[PDB]
Amino acid sequence: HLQEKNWSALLTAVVIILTIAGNILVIMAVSLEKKLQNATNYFLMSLAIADMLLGFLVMPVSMLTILYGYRWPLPSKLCAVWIYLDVLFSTAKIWHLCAISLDRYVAIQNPISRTKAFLKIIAVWTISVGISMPIPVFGLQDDSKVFKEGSCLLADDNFVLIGSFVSFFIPLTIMVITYFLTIKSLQKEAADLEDNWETLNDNLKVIEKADNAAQVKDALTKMRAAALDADILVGQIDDALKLANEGKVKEAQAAAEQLKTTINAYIQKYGQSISNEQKACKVLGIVFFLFVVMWCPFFITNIMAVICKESCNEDVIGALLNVFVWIGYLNSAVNPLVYTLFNKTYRSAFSRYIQCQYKE
Ligand SMILES: CN1CCN2c3c(cccc31)[C@@H]1CN(CCCC(=O)c3ccc(F)cc3)CC[C@@H]12
Ligand SMILES: CC(C)CCC[C@@H](C)[C@H]1CC[C@H]2[C@@H]3CC=C4C[C@@H](O)CC[C@]4(C)[C@H]3CC[C@]12C
Ligand SMILES: CC(C)CCC[C@@H](C)[C@H]1CC[C@H]2[C@@H]3CC=C4C[C@@H](O)CC[C@]4(C)[C@H]3CC[C@]12C
Ligand SMILES: CCCCCCCC/C=C\CCCCCCCC(=O)OC[C@H](O)CO
Ligand SMILES: CCCCCCCC/C=C\CCCCCCCC(=O)OC[C@H](O)CO
Ligand SMILES: [Mg+2]
């Protein structure tokens, strides 16, 4: 049933090549660059493996169906295995994004490891293997579940409805909530730090203008409390407090000037740590946004088709969905570009590997 009228097959092969190339560069950058050895970038590498296996195993079979007028050319029991691999890789992807969002949030609230990251990644893959499992279990026993007019697709309306809910809308919702609370957490952490900075800076000025021990002691006690809210400084403040208690006003004032170097060092370090987390959250927010928006047409159209079953042209719906599948496959090529545009470490690593300089 081969059709030679397929300029679409040129555009799909581009999407396969951008997907495989981009994701190998992500996989090599997390493998080789120490500056990317962290839990977030381990999940982004697992995401890249899911994208790479879509480009090798799922996307070329999808191109093969376009060439034969969406008439399944492979043996008939490979249809349910193809859909299984297709739904598993993308389900693993949305639970990866949702695992990154939740991990970052929990990491702020619990301020206190490769193995912990690999436990979570492996848990996300097992969760996606088990939830996607009804597709081959029922679809290999009943062709009517994975075939409509000799097209291979998920043909049971109930798998599409229940599947979209448990594998798209629920983890999207968890992703959206945990991302929003992460942005509020980080704004509050930046805000509490600035408040602590004002209290420390103002008290240092009081100690500087002090003529009496009581003023220095009151200011240093207030400084100690602020330091606890944000240690090495707390001990240094206690030494300055001891001088003030024994009436050594001048000596305590000098010790307070010594505190300034410790205060400035910590403030700048914790303050540039928080703006690193905020920038990281923004890039993840582009990844998150582009994964949902690119898959939204396919899911919403497919839910509209179930709702207006009798009333709507299923031939036009099936044509649009075929297009909409490829907007979703194009997302497999976007994550590496996003990292090039907004992460210098990824841009630098990609630049060397393309030049085949694999040495650190
Ligand atoms: C008309 N028609 C075209 C062919 N196509 C098709 C399917 C079902 C019904 C109708 C179909 C199949 C779906 N496949 C994409 C699955 C996306 C997914 O599982 C997922 C999970 C979680 C996510 F967060 C985001 C995406 C593309 C290939 C098949
Ligand atoms: C079952 C198939 C489909 C996917 C299974 C996922 C496995 C193979 C993947 C997902 C995430 C991956 C890890 C992600 C991070 C790192 C650290 C890096 O410096 C070297 C590779 C290493 C150690 C990877 C090893 C393999 C890994 C655990
Ligand atoms: C929400 C955004 C991001 C994209 C989603 C697009 C969805 C909601 C819209 C866009 C165009 C729409 C289609 C336009 C016209 C027709 C022809 C009619 O006989 C059957 C329904 C059908 C096929 C519509 C179904 C819903 C549809 C697919
Ligand atoms: C095939 C075998 C694997 C499948 C089953 C594996 C399940 C492991 C789940 C979690 C590990 C991570 C927990 C350890 C990390 C400590 C930090 C912490 O507080 O995490 C708790 C949670 O993230 C906030 O509620
Ligand atoms: C005796 C045989 C009866 C067989 C059962 C018939 C009725 C059960 C309905 C749904 C099953 C579970 C579906 C949810 C999980 C599988 C689908 C999935 O993961 O999602 C697909 C994808 O997300 C969508 O585009
Ligand atoms: Mg003030």
Q: What is the dihedral of CA 18, 20, 21, 24, to 10 degrees?
A: 150
| Cβ–Cβ < 8 Å for 256, 307 | no
| Cβ–Cβ < 8 Å for 70, 142 | no
* Ligand 5 binding pocket mutation candidate from 159, 164, 166 (most atoms within 8 A of CB): 159
The three-state DSSP-derived secondary structure of 47-116 is HHHHHHHHHHHHHHHHHHHHHCCCCCCCCCCHHHHHHHHHHHHHHHHHHHHHHHHHHHHHHHHCCCCHHH
Atom of ligand 1 nearest to the CA of 94: 24
Single-letter amino acid code for the residue at 140: L
CATH of the domain at 219: 1.20.120.10
Angle (CA) 331 336 341, round 5°: 115
Q: Write phi, then psi, for 206 (nearest 5 degrees).
A: -60, -45
CA distance 93 to 125: 9
Q: Which domain holds residue 239?
A: 192-268
Tokens (6 digits) for 62: 């999808």
Does 127 contact ligand 1 (Cβ within 6 A)?
Answer: no
CA distance 82 to 192: 52
Q: Write phi, then psi, for 211 (nearest 5 degrees).
A: -115, -10
CA distance 18 to 100: 24
| Cβ–Cβ < 8 Å for 135, 160 | no
Method by which the coordinates were obtained: X-ray
Any residues with CB less than 8 A from the CB of 151 and at least 6 apart, and which?
Answer: 65, 70, 71, 72, 318
Cα→Cα distances 254→27, 38, 225, 302, Å: 53, 42, 20, 72
What residues pair up with 147 in beta bridges, in sequence order?
152
User: 74 C-alpha to center of ligand 4: Å?
Assistant: 40
Give the closest residue (by CA) to ligand 5 atom 2.
138
CA distance 186 to 174: 18
User: 49 C-alpha to center of ligand 6: Å?
Assistant: 51
Ligand at shortest distance from the CA of 104: 4
Ligand at shortest distance from the CA of 297: 3
**What is residue 156's DSSP assignment?**
-
Does 317 contact ligand 3 (Cβ within 6 A)?
Answer: yes
**H or E segment and range at residue 226:** helix 213-229
Helix axes 314-342, 344-354, angle to 10 degrees: 90
User: 272 C-alpha to center of ligand 4: Å?
Assistant: 29
Does 155 contact ligand 1 (Cβ within 6 A)?
Answer: no
User: 29 C-alpha to center of ligand 2: Å?
Assistant: 13
Tokens (6 digits) for 158: 């109930």
**H or E segment and range at residue 169:** none
Tokens (6 digits) for 154: 């998920």
User: 140 C-alpha to center of ligand 5: Å?
Assistant: 13
- Work out the number of other CB atoms within 10 angstroms of the CB of residue 14: 11
Ramachandran bin of 99, using left for φ above 0, alpha for ψ from -120 to 50, beta for the remaining angles: alpha
Does 303 contact ligand 5 (Cβ within 6 A)?
Answer: no
Kindly provide the b/e burial profile for residues 196-234, where b requires at least 16 CB atoms within 10 angstroms of the residue's own CB: bbebbeebbebbeebeebebbbbbbebbbebbeebeebe
Instruction: Please return the burial class of 183, using the count of CB atoms within 10 Å of its CB with bins 0-12, 13-18 and 19+.
Output: middle
Does 90 contact ligand 1 (Cβ within 6 A)?
Answer: yes
CA distance 123 to 229: 36
Single-letter amino acid code for the residue at 38: N
CA distance 250 to 136: 80
CA distance 81 to 259: 66
Ligand at shortest distance from the CA of 312: 3
Chain centre to alpha carbon of residue 275: 17
Widest distance between CA atoms in the chain: 97
| Cβ–Cβ < 8 Å for 95, 127 | yes
User: 93 C-alpha to center of ligand 4: Å?
Assistant: 18
Does 162 contact ligand 5 (Cβ within 6 A)?
Answer: yes
CA distance 162 to 153: 16
Give the closest residue (by CA) to ligand 3 atom 6.
297
Chain centre to alpha carbon of residue 54: 18
Cα→Cα distances 84→67, 88, 131, 316, Å: 21, 6, 10, 25
Does 86 contact ligand 1 (Cβ within 6 A)?
Answer: yes
Give the closest residue (by CA) to ligand 5 atom 25.
160
Q: What's the resolution in A?
A: 2.5
Tokens (6 digits) for 77: 């029991």
For every residue of 133-144, DSSP letters joined together read THHHHHHTT-GG
Cα→Cα distances 152→68, 168, 299, 332, Å: 12, 21, 17, 22
For every residue of 181-213, DSSP letters joined together read HHHHHHHHHHHHHHHHHHHHHHHHHHHHH--SH
User: 239 C-alpha to center of ligand 6: Å?
Assistant: 24
Ramachandran bin of 149, using left for φ above 0, alpha for ψ from -120 to 50, beta for the remaining angles: left
Does 129 contact ligand 4 (Cβ within 6 A)?
Answer: no
